[PDB]
Scaffold this active site. Structure first.
Site, PDB file in Angstrom:
ATOM      1  N   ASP A 347       0.839  -1.187   0.000  1.00 59.65           N
ATOM      2  CA  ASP A 347       0.000   0.000   0.000  1.00 59.65           C
ATOM      3  C   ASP A 347       0.878   1.242   0.000  1.00 59.65           C
ATOM      4  O   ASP A 347       2.000   1.225   0.509  1.00 59.65           O
ATOM      5  CB  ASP A 347      -0.957   0.021   1.201  1.00 59.65           C
ATOM      6  CG  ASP A 347      -0.277  -0.340   2.507  1.00 59.65           C
ATOM      7  OD1 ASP A 347       0.966  -0.275   2.589  1.00 59.65           O
ATOM      8  OD2 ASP A 347      -0.996  -0.691   3.464  1.00 59.65           O
ATOM      9  N   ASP A 668      -2.252  -3.095   6.881  1.00 57.58           N
ATOM     10  CA  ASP A 668      -2.390  -2.300   8.097  1.00 57.58           C
ATOM     11  C   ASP A 668      -3.809  -1.767   8.129  1.00 57.58           C
ATOM     12  O   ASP A 668      -4.221  -1.057   7.207  1.00 57.58           O
ATOM     13  CB  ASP A 668      -1.385  -1.154   8.131  1.00 57.58           C
ATOM     14  CG  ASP A 668      -1.697  -0.141   9.213  1.00 57.58           C
ATOM     15  OD1 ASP A 668      -2.157  -0.552  10.297  1.00 57.58           O
ATOM     16  OD2 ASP A 668      -1.496   1.069   8.974  1.00 57.58           O
ATOM     17  N   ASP A 672      -8.179  -5.354   6.694  1.00 53.12           N
ATOM     18  CA  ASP A 672      -7.117  -6.144   6.077  1.00 53.12           C
ATOM     19  C   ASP A 672      -6.908  -7.444   6.841  1.00 53.12           C
ATOM     20  O   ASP A 672      -5.791  -7.817   7.183  1.00 53.12           O
ATOM     21  CB  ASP A 672      -5.826  -5.334   6.016  1.00 53.12           C
ATOM     22  CG  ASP A 672      -5.876  -4.233   4.978  1.00 53.12           C
ATOM     23  OD1 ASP A 672      -6.616  -4.389   3.987  1.00 53.12           O
ATOM     24  OD2 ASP A 672      -5.166  -3.220   5.142  1.00 53.12           O
TER      25      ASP A 672
END
Ligand SMILES: CCCCC/C=C/C/C=C/C/C=C/C/C=C/CCCC(=O)O[C@@H](COC(=O)CCCCCCCCCCCCCCCCC)COP(=O)(O)O[C@@H]1[C@H](O)[C@H](O)[C@@H](OP(=O)(O)O)[C@H](OP(=O)(O)O)[C@H]1O
Ligand SMILES: Nc1ncnc2c1ncn2[C@@H]1O[C@H](COP(=O)(O)OP(=O)(O)NP(=O)(O)O)[C@@H](O)[C@H]1O
Ligand SMILES: *[C@@H]1O[C@H](CO)[C@@H](O)[C@H](O)[C@H]1NC(C)=O
Ligand SMILES: *[C@@H]1O[C@H](CO)[C@@H](O)[C@H](O)[C@H]1NC(C)=O
Ligand SMILES: *[C@@H]1O[C@H](CO)[C@@H](O)[C@H](O)[C@H]1NC(C)=O
Ligand SMILES: *[C@@H]1O[C@H](CO)[C@@H](O)[C@H](O)[C@H]1NC(C)=O
Ligand SMILES: *[C@@H]1O[C@H](CO)[C@@H](O)[C@H](O)[C@H]1NC(C)=O
Ligand SMILES: *[C@@H]1O[C@H](CO)[C@@H](O)[C@H](O)[C@H]1NC(C)=O
Ligand SMILES: [Ca+2]
Ligand SMILES: [Mg+2]
EC number: 7.2.2.10
Lengths: 935, 214
Positions: A347, A668, A672
């Protein structure tokens, strides 16, 4: 007593409401019994803790730890490979007494070493795991308190992603939803509320909402504590290899014994006539005993008892050394799976960027500034309004604090975009304190909460007399089009129309986005307020705004990731980015990172397009539709938590590409959880990672850097390599050994190497090769080879070429010695020696040459990929040097002062020098064999 | 003087037939106390009885049995009478060293012990050009000692060019003769230098290959 409360909350049904109403009223009616002040809190003094926890006893004690050193020793003793060795040692020891005993001790010593080492490392690992993994938001005081202490009465503040540490009655909150599958087995989101279900359970995960809780009791009496107290492809391939090697060794041993017995009987009875006189029965059985023991020892040489030890040693060494590289490993099998990793789905924020929001460009006064301006440049009547619309707009808890440590940066504590806004305001040589202090919650009444649904936060202030002052911050596209005037020029409120805003978007917003800047917009409004507006209709109550200024925030890309991603792409790994930012900013940052290069054909579709283009038949998800997207996808902007999960599922489950894919996911956050468990290996975030994302991951990154992940990959490959080189060495040795025995039983009637010497050779090879060749440190050269397949065999082409070449050299030298050593050395032949004969120095030379060749080939067996410089990095592993030198010294003492029991006769100086000459010749032959193309 | 009639001497051959040795005290006026067999001055076990006529039987006669036998007669008040029955047989070498390796400038020792009777005459030989010649003391460095079984040949200040070779004890006797051989080797002083020159020749070409590769 806590027991009554526990039994009360055990109902877990709709009847709890009734019970709570019928006996205990509301929370504050009996909160005095628990001795807890909700609003005031608890200072946190030790006498208060003792008074309120007079019968607490203890916290949740760690598990009982049933695995002691003796228990681990017993567990490792019943290994399939070691059973053969210990059984054979028992047979040898029993058969000796009829120095034969010296055989059995050797086998026993090997077993002892292995078991001890295994037990020790296992115990060590467990202690490390307990030590490494053991401020809690449930503080009680206004200040944060550490996680360790847990008291009855503490007022928990619960947020999304908090793992509930205890049990407590709910107090107040907004739309709290919790996953209770850890307790019920039902993965449905239970909505908590005082009027329906106010209990909160330890071990359950907060999926949505926020609130506060008055814990019923510290005492770990929650249902999750009660139930918890009440409660590898490489490994399979190695097991298969070990059983095949054992079978081959057994066949060879049986054939050797049969041949020896056949020779003895035919030669002594049929070729030469000798009757079976009873008085000669002892001799005729001693011969048989000798033959049997020879066969037995051959078997224990051929059985690879050092393979599991090598695997465990390499895994333990890598796991211990990863912690000093900012990777902490929870699941052991993730250490080697990362070696084969072929994709990474990370990410943008937190991992690829420093997650520090600063303002570098602005569009104020109808002028575009690329640097922070002077306060005099901006006209008056606008700076005051901007400060009012920034300081009071949102999240009064986002305080900016000085570092006050080694001249560090002023780290932020709250929402980071708002923190960057406050930093920009402060950098305008102003202060938000004179504005926030004069505006407490006093008149702050109408506030719209911030969420990804709206991407905007708005507040109303009653200070304007007979008027209102709406404030708004938006994502420059949701909110910007809602405005109706522009505060341009010297405070003039020009008319905002669809015409000029279209040109303005391509004038300033697009260049701002292309610079990697997230664009936000600030707007204000003034309601007449004479008729009270009905503020529930979000469509109209947010329109008719007035844009003040548009500012572009940024977070710099970490200096290490532009090279880490390059190394990842060089090692055959493809990395994608999944982010919630708009597509322009995501693409701009993905170019600076190096994920997508400016000239190429790589998809950058959004979340809505991604969901639309993978669902052809109604809303059904089809793998065929996904298989047309993920091969050429690099950026996924404006995504959803389920979008990452569906992308991971589509990549892993695809059977389209020629190679099966193993993916790693960095995560995170709250949602998730499934996406981070479907993946083959999950990376949780060290500082920014919530407890829900830490309890589902395999590895945790301590420093948060993406460049740590690459290190993990390297430390994975090394593991594989270590095992490989060990295998190489071991195989070569036993090949030669076995062949020698099978040629000693046919040409002559005895093996040139006696049983005790063969057991010394087995000890060296198995135990010391496992201990010395499995602790090789990794080099940066590992990150230059494409990831290995799934059905790739252990014995690669170069390994088997090395095995065959070195076996050829050793076999020719040994046979030449065995048949012409009486003439080469002028040393009197030791062949055809009768039973109970003194040792000769024709056979001691053969034993010594065999052992020296093994040591000098152990030096060679540290290179698997055809490298020529064998001595490269030899001094970075002191265990190797220590073991090799110790073995050399022990061999010297065995040959010299190790006489009749070891079947060794003392040698002079020139014979020792000739043995060393032949070993160094083995090194030179290793140099020769390397210049042959395996293709 | 007591009169003892003894059996004739016996030559032990390879035949397995037991051999009986006999003594008869044909004339004695003294009160006999006891009697016993002795071989080479050693009293045989369990041979003390009344035995005014005494017998000794060998069930498996071998060359190790042959020797100078006596049957001693002890009286209450008379001196003992011993007599002698000699059991002859060819000698056999029972012990020797297969080879003797020694450094030049040192001493060398070789021996050949044997069993039989009458005791043999030890002469040594040296194998030259395919035939065994007699030993020669042409420098005073050869010492030969002869005993009943033991013979010993000693050499001092070994010379590499002359001494090495195979020597042979010879063990002759009226019944027959037997012989075995021993190989003497003298090792040069510069022996530990040739392998050393080899080891260097492997290092300075193991280095050259590596550094050129870099
Ligand atoms: C080397 O050449 O070692 C000897 C070791 O022998 C002894 O250890 C005792 C017997 C002495 C040998 C003598 C005669 C034979 O070893 P093996 O025959 O017992 O085991 C083979 C071997 O490991 C191959 O290298 C693998 O080849 P791969 O992994 O590449 O496919 C193969 O694997 P597979 O059957 O799937 O084809 C294994 O079976
Ligand atoms: N304090 C704020 N007030 C109003 N809008 C905001 C605020 N912070 C961010 N935004 C905007 O509203 C959205 C909030 O998204 P946010 O939760 O910050 O994640 P993201 O930046 O979209 N993705 P990611 O970087 O992966 O976390 C974005 O479009 C922002 O531009
Ligand atoms: C054997 O016995 C006889 C008869 O008594 C006796 O005359 C003779 O001396 C004895 N010999 C011994 C005891 O040696
Ligand atoms: C010798 O003694 C034995 C044993 O008594 C006897 O049989 C034999 O007749 C004796 N021979 C002579 C010649 O006296
Ligand atoms: C018996 O005495 C004689 C006396 O001449 C002696 O020669 C002989 O050796 C003696 N026998 C033994 C066995 O000592
Ligand atoms: C050889 O001569 C030396 C010196 O005179 C002497 O001591 C030695 O006994 C002799 N040996 C033989 C076998 O003649
Ligand atoms: C040699 O003769 C001696 C007596 O001098 C004797 O002790 C020894 O047993 C005999 N045999 C051997 C093989 O030494
Ligand atoms: C010993 O003499 C005999 C008789 O000739 C013979 O068999 C043997 O070979 C001789 N020894 C040597 C050393 O020649
Ligand atoms: Ca073994
Ligand atoms: Mg987001």
């Amino acid at each position: 007593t806590m027991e009554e409360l526990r039994s009360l909350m055990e109902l877990r049904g709709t009847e709890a409401v009734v019970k709570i109403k019928e006996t205990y009223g509301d929370t504050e009616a009996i909160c005095r019994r628990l001795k807890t002040s909700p609003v005031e809190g608890l200072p946190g003094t030790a006498p208060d803790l003792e008074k309120r926890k007079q019968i607490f006893g203890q916290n949740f004690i760690p598990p009982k730890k049933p695995k002691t050193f003796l228990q681990l020793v017993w567990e490792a003793l019943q290994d399939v490979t070691l059973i053969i060795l210990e059984i054979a040692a028992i047979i040898s020891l029993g058969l000796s007494f009829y120095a034969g005993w010296i055989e059995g001790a050797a086998i026993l010593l090997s077993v002892i070493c292995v078991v001890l080492v295994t037990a020790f490392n296992d115990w060590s690992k467990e202690k490390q795991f307990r030590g490494l993994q053991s401020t809690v938001v449930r503080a009680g005081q206004v200040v944060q308190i550490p996680v360790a202490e847990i008291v009855v009465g503490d007022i928990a503040q619960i947020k999304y992603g908090d793992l509930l540490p205890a049990d407590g009655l709910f107090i107040q909150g907004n739309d709290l939803k919790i996953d209770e599958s850890s307790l019920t087995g039902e993965s449905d989101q239970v909505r908590k509320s005082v009027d329906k279900d106010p209990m909160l359970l330890s071990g359950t995960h907060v999926m949505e909402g926020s609130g506060r809780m008055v814990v019923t009791a510290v005492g770990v009496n929650s249902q999750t504590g009660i139930i918890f107290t009440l409660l590898s492809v490489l490994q399979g391939k190695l097991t298969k290899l070990a059983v095949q090697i054992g079978k081959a060794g057994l066949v060879m041993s049986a054939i050797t014994v049969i041949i020896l017995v056949l020779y003895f009987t035919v030669d002594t009875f049929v070729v030469n006539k000798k009757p079976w006189l009873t008085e000669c029965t002892p001799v005729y059985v001693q011969y048989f005993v000798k033959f049997f023991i020879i066969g037995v020892t051959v078997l224990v040489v051929a059985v690879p008892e050092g393979l599991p030890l090598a695997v465990t040693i390499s895994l333990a060494y890598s796991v211990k050394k990863m912690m000093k590289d900012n990777n902490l490993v929870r699941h052991l099998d993730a250490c080697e799976t990362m070696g084969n990793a072929t994709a990474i789905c990370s990410d943008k924020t937190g991992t690829l960027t420093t997650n520090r929001m600063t303002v570098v460009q602005a569009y104020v006064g109808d002028v575009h500034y690329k640097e922070i301006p002077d306060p005099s440049s901006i006209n008056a009547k606008t700076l005051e309004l901007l400060v009012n619309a920034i300081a009071i707009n949102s999240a009064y808890t986002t305080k900016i604090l000085p570092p006050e440590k080694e001249g560090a940066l002023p780290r932020q504590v709250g929402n980071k975009t708002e923190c960057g806004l406050l930093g920009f305001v402060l950098d305008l040589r102003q202060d938000y304190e004179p504005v926030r202090s004069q505006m407490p919650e006093e008149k702050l009444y109408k506030v719209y909460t911030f969420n990804s649904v709206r991407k905007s936060m708005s507040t109303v202030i009653k200070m304007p007399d007979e008027s209102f002052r709406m404030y708004s911050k938006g994502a420059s596209e949701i909110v910007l089009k809602k405005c109706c005037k522009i505060l341009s020029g010297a405070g003039e409120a020009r008319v905002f129309r669809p015409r000029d805003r279209d040109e303005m978007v391509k004038k300033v917003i697009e260049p701002m986005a292309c610079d990697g800047l997230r664009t936000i917009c600030v707007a204000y409004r003034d309601f007449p307020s004479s008729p009270e507006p009905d503020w529930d209709n979000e469509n109209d109550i947010l329109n008719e705004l007035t844009c003040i200024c548009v500012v572009g925030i940024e977070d710099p890309v970490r200096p290490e990731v532009p090279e880490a991603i390059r190394k990842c792409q060089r090692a055959g790994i493809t990395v994608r980015m999944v982010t919630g930012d708009n597509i322009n900013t995501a693409r701009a940052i993905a170019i600076k990172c190096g994920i997508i290069h400016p000239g190429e054909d790589f998809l950058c579709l959004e979340g809505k397009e991604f969901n639309r283009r993978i669902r052809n038949e109604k809303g059904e998800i089809e793998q065929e539709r996904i298989d047309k997207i993920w091969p050429k996808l690099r950026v996924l902007a404006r995504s959803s938590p389920t979008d990452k999960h569906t992308l991971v599922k589509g990549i892993i489950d695809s059977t389209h590409t020629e190679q099966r894919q193993v993916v790693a996911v960095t995560g995170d956050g709250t949602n998730d959880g499934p996406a981070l468990k479907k993946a083959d290996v999950g990376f949780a975030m060290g500082i920014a990672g919530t407890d829900v994302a830490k309890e589902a991951s395999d590895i945790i990154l301590t420093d948060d850097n993406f460049s740590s992940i690459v290190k993990a990959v390297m430390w994975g490959r090394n593991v594989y390599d270590s095992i490989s080189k060990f295998l190489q060495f071991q195989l070569t040795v036993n090949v030669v050994a076995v062949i020698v025995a099978f040629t000693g039983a046919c040409i002559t009637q005895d093996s040139p190497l006696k049983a005790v010497q063969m057991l010394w050779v087995n000890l060296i090879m198995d135990t010391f090769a496992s201990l010395a060749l499995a602790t090789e440190p990794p080099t940066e050269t590992l990150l230059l080879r494409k990831p290995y397949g799934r059905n790739k065999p252990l014995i690669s082409r170069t390994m088997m070429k090395n095995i065959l070449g070195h076996a050829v050299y050793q076999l020719t030298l040994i046979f030449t010695l065995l048949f012409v050593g009486e003439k080469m050395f002028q040393i009197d032949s030791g062949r055809n020696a009768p039973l109970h004969s003194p040792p000769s120095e024709h056979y001691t030379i053969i034993f010594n040459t065999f052992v020296m060749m093994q040591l000098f080939n152990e030096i060679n067996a540290r290179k698997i990929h055809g490298e020529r410089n064998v001595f490269d990095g030899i001094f970075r592993n002191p265990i190797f040097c220590t073991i090799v030198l110790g073995t050399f010294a022990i061999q010297i003492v065995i040959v010299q002062f190790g006489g009749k029991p070891f079947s060794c006769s003392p040698l002079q100086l020139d014979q020792w020098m000739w043995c060393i000459f032949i070993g160094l010749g083995e090194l030179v032959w290793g140099q020769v064999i390397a210049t042959i193309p395996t293709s | 003087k007591p009169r003892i009639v003894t059996s004739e001497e016996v030559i032990i051959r390879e035949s397995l037939l037991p051999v009986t040795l006999q003594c008869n005290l044909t004339s004695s006026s003294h009160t006999l106390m006891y009697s016993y067999w002795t071989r080479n001055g050693v009293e045989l076990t369990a041979t003390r009885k009344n035995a005014s006529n005494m017998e000794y039987r060998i069930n498996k006669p071998r060359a190790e049995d042959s020797g100078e036998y006596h049957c001693v007669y002890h009286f209450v008040s008379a001196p003992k009478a011993n007599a002698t029955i000699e059991v002859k047989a060819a000698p056999d070498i029972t012990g020797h060293k297969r080879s003797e390796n020694k450094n030049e400038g040192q001493d060398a020792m070789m021996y050949c012990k044997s069993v039989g009777y009458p005791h043999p005459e030890w002469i040594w030989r040296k194998k030259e050009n395919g035939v065994f010649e007699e030993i020669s003391n042409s420098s005073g460095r050869f010492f030969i000692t002869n005993k009943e079984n033991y013979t010993e040949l000693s050499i001092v200040n070994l010379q590499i060019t002359e001494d090495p070779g195979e020597y042979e004890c010879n063990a002759t006797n009226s019944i027959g003769s037997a012989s075995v051989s021993t190989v003497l080797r003298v090792r040069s002083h510069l022996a530990p230098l040739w392998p050393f020159l080899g080891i260097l020749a492997e290092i300075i070409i193991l280095v050259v290959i590596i550094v050129v590769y870099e």
